[PDB]
Amino acid sequence: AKVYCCPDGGIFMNFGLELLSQLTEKGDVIQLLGALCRQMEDFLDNWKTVVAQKRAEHFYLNFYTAEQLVYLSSELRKPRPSEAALMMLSFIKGKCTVQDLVQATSACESKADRYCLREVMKKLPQQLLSEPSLMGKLQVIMMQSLVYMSAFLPHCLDLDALGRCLAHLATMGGTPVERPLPKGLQAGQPNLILCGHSEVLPAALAIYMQAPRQPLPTFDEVLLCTPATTIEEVELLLRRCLTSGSQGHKVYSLLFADQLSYEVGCQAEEFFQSLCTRAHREDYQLVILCDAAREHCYIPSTFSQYKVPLVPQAPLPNIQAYLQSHYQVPKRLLSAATVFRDGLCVGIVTSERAGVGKSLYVNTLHTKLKAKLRDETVPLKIIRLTEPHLDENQVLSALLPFLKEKYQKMPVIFHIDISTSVQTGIPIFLFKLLILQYLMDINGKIWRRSPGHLYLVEIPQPLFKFLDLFPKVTCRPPKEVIDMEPAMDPVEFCSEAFQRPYQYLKRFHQQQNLDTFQYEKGSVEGSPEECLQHFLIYCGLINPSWSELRNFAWFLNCQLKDCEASIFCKSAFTGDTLRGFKNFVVTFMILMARDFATPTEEDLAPFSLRKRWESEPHPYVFFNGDHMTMTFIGFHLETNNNGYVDAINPSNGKVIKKDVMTKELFDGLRLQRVPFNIDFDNLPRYEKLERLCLALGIEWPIDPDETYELTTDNMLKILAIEMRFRCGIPVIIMGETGCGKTRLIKFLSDLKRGSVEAETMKLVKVHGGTTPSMIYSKVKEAERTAFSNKAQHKLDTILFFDEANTTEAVSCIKEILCDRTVDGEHLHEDSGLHIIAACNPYRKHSQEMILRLESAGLGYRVSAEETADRLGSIPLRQLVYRVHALPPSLIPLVWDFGQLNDSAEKLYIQQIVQRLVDSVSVNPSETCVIADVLSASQMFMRKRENECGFVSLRDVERCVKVFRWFHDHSDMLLKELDKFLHESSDSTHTFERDPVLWSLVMAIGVCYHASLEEKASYRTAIARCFPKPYNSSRAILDEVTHVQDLFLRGAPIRTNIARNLALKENVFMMVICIELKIPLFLVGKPGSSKSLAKIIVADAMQGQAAFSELFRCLKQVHLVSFQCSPHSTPQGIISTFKQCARF
C-alpha cells in the first residue's frame, strides 16, 4: 500500500496477484485509513474463524503451526518439494518420498473445484466493477478470498486441499499407533499428575511404556512445556487430542505444564473448555504432568478436579531396555550405528572428571566407521554447546544446513558436546532429540532424528539419574581402569610421542645405562599396560587424567628429542668417557616435568587452589636450538659428601632431588664448558639477552625494550611459556591486573620477531560481553595472519586472550586450548600460532566491603539470595573479580605469575610519571615527588584487603592524566582561586601556590580521595610524602575544599539550596570527570544532591555561554540521558552512545 499525505491524496493498493487489479481512491486520507484499518480488522476476525473451522474439520492440519502450514502450502504444489518439507511430512507418513506426495496431491483434487474456481475467476471482474469505491471492491476481494481462496493464489494449496493431501498421506504409510492408558488414569477426561521435578520425565516414560514395541512419540502426542512456550502449539496439542480423523489411539501429554506462563495457561484452559463444549472425541488420553512443588500455578490449580492420586512409575532397567530396544537399528540399513554397541543409534559419552576419553572415544568410533565402510568421507559433525541455558535453536541451526541435503544419509556421526557451563537446559533437549526424536522451529523447519545416523552426546558430570536412561559410555582415568576394569589407546601407544619417553623410562626403571641408545624410531615391544604403569610411576600425580599423562609424555618427548639432536651423545661416543649423561638427562627432565606437567569458601576452593606460587623451585635444563650447548637456570649444582652432585635452589640451602649426577659427569661437563651453576642477577643486560636468545633459539638478538628488567624470575617465566608451547602443553596463566603478564608476553613476542614490523602478538581483551562468535572469528583470523607470518617471515604468532575468564564463553577458550578446535573445525599444527590465555584469581571481597556495598544508597535491587549472577552460592557482586568458573581440563593447566614486588612497582610508577607528564618542564625532583605520592597511595590501598580492581598501574596512568589536566590549567585555575580566596576568605588562605605541588594535591583529590569513606586516614598517610605546604591532613583537606567551593561558585547562583559538602563534591567530580572522559558513578539515597549536581554541571559547563570566567575556559557539554528501567534492553544503551557520537 501507498498512502499519499497530500490534500486529496488518497490510498493506492496492490495485491501482488495477476487476477486482481490495483485499487486507488482519493479523499481525506485519515478517514480512508480509519475505514481501511476497520475493514482489515474485521477481515482478521473472519480469517481467524475460518482457519479455526478448517483446523476443526481437517485433523492432520494440526501438526503444523500457521507459518509451517504456509511453508507446506507453498511447497507441496511445487513439482519437487524441498527436503525440509519432506522432513516435516515424515511425521504424518514416515519415509515420505516425492512420489507418495505426487500421489497424495493428485488424489486430492476434483474437477468440480476446478471449474468452480474458474467460474469465480471469470465472474470476479464484473463483480468488482459493480462496486464504485475502494472499500466496496476490497470488501468483495476479501469475501471471495475467504470462500474461494485457491483462485486468488494459483500456486499454493488452500487449507482444504492441503488438509486433504495430509489426510491422504496419512493413509498410505499404514499400521497406526495404539496406546492404552495405565491404570489409575481415565480415558475420557484430563489426567493430572503431580510428581516432583525430577520425576516428570521418567513418569512420562512409564505412560508410553505401557504399550511396548510401539514406536516412541514425537512432537505430536508429547508437548514439553517451558516458559516461553507459545499458546499456538499448546492449542495444537489440544486439537490433536480432541478431534476425530486419526487412525490409532495415542496419548497426549503436557509435560511440565505448570512451566507455562499465566496468560498461556489461561488461554489454554479456556480453549480446552471451548473444544470440550463444541465437538470432540470421548476417547481423549490427555495426560498432564506438573511439578508437585508448583501446584499454585494456573494449570494444576485449575485442573485439580481431574487429579490422579497415583504417579506412574516404571523401574529403571525396564526403561533402559525400552529405549535401547527402540535405539537398536537393525542390520542391512547402512547406518553409522554399526560401530557403536552393535547398532545403537544414540549414545551418551560421559565421565566424572575431565580429560579422560570422551572426545577420543567419539573420534575412535569415527575411524572405526571409516575403516568399516571403506571411505574416508564419512562426516563427523561437532556441535559445541557452551552457553548456559542450552538453546535448541542452536543445535537445530547447526543441523539444518548439514543434512537436509540428502547426500551422505547412510553414515553420519553427530558429536554434540555439552560443555560444563550449560547448567540449565539439558534434560529437555535430550528428551526431545533422543526420545521424541525431533527439534522444531515453530515458524520453520522440523528436524527428525534419523535411525541411521549416530547422535553421540558428550556430557560431563539430579542430572545423573536422567543420563542413566540412555545407552551410556563412561570413561575412566588411568588409575580407575587398572584396578576396576588395555586402557591406553593403541594409536597413542604406538605414537612417537608416547614412545621416546616409554623407551627411555623403560631402560631407566631397571637401572640400565643409556650410553648407546638412540631410540631407533619405531615402536618397541611394550605393552600399553606397562607403558601406562611406567608413565604412572614418573609423573608424580597420584590420580592423573589422560590430559596430564599426555602432557607429561609430550614434555619428556620434546626434551629427549632435543637431547638426541645435540652434540653431547656424539661427543660421548668420540671421547669415550662422558657416560652417565643420559641418566642425568632423564632424572632432571622428570624434575622439570614435575614443574610443568603437574599441579599438586567451598565454592572458590577448586579455583583458588593455587597451592604453589612462582615463589617455588623452578629448576630448568634446556638444550638449545640445534647448538652444541645447554642452558641451566633456576638451580645450582653442589657436590654432596657421599660422592655425588646435588641440585639446590639459589640463595637458599635446600636440596632439590639429591644425587642427580656423579663427580665424573660433573667434571666432564666442566671440561665441555656448559653454562652450569651461573648467577643470573649479577650479570649485565647483553649477556642475559644472549642467554635468553640462546635458549629461545633466536639468532642475532635485538633488545626490544631495555627498560624491561630481565631478573631471573622473568627469565624463568619466559622459558616456561616458550617450553609449554614448544612441547605442546596449553598456556593459561592466573595473574592479577598488576603483575607484568602482558608486558612479559609483549617482550617475548617483540624479542622473537627481532626487527620485522609484522604483527605477531594479537591481544584480545575478553570481557563480559564477549560472545563465542567473537572468540571463534578472532581465532580464525589470527590463524590466517599466522599462516601469512610463517609464509613470509618464518615467524611464530601469538594470540593472547587477556583476562580470558570474565566471559561466560570461557568454555570456548578451553576448546581452543585443550582439544585444538574452532567451533568444530580443527586448528592446523603446521600453522604456527600459539594461544595464551590469562585469567583472574577467584577471591571474595572482605565482609566490611560486602556490608558497605550492600548499603550503598538503597539496597541492591535484586538481593544476594535471588541473584542469578552467581559462581556457586556466591554472587558475582561479592567476588573481587567478576569471573566465571574455569572449565575443568583448564584447572590443572593454570599456573601463577608472581603477584608484584615493590622494587618493580615503584620503578614502573616512575616510568609512568616520566612518560605521560614527562620531565621536559616539570623538574626531576618534582617527578620523584609525584612518583612517591602515587606509590604511597597505591601502598595505602593495598593495606586494606578490599578493593575491586586490585588497583593497578592503569589507575596510576589515569591519575597522572588528571595531574596533567590540572597542570595545564594551573594558570587560570590558580588565578581564579586567588580571586575567590581574596573575595571570600581571610589573608591566611592567600599564599602563592606551586602549580606542580598544587596539581598533585588536586590529582590526589580527584583520583583517590573522593572515592574513599575514611578520608582522614588517607590524608594522614599521604601527608607524610608531600613537601612543605601540604604536610598535614588539614592542608590537603582545606585545599580541596577551597577548589570545590571555587567550582561551585563558578556555577550559576542558587538560593534555598542544600549547599552542603556532598553537592560541592559531586559538582567538582562531575566537571572533572567530564573534562577527562573518566566515567563517574554516583550512588546515594534519593535526596542526596546528585541530580542537582547534574543540572548544575550541565548548566555551568557551557562553552562560551557560561556565566563565569572559570567555566568559560572549560569545555562545552551536551548531555544525552537514558533512564535505566529493570526491563531495559542493551540496544538502548548502544543507541544512546551512538547518539552521543552523532552529536
Ligand SMILES: Nc1ncnc2c1ncn2[C@@H]1O[C@H](COP(=O)(O)OP(=O)(O)OP(=O)(O)O)[C@@H](O)[C@H]1O
Ligand atoms: N586412552 C588414552 N590413551 C592415550 N591418550 C589418551 C587416552 N584418552 C585420552 N588421551 C589423551 O587425552 C587428551 C584429551 O583427552 P580427551 O580430549 O579425549 O578427553 P575429554 O574427555 O574430551 O576431555 P574433556 O573432559 O575436557 O572434554 C587427548 O589429546 C588424548 O591424546
Ligand SMILES: [Mg+2]
Ligand atoms: Mg571433549
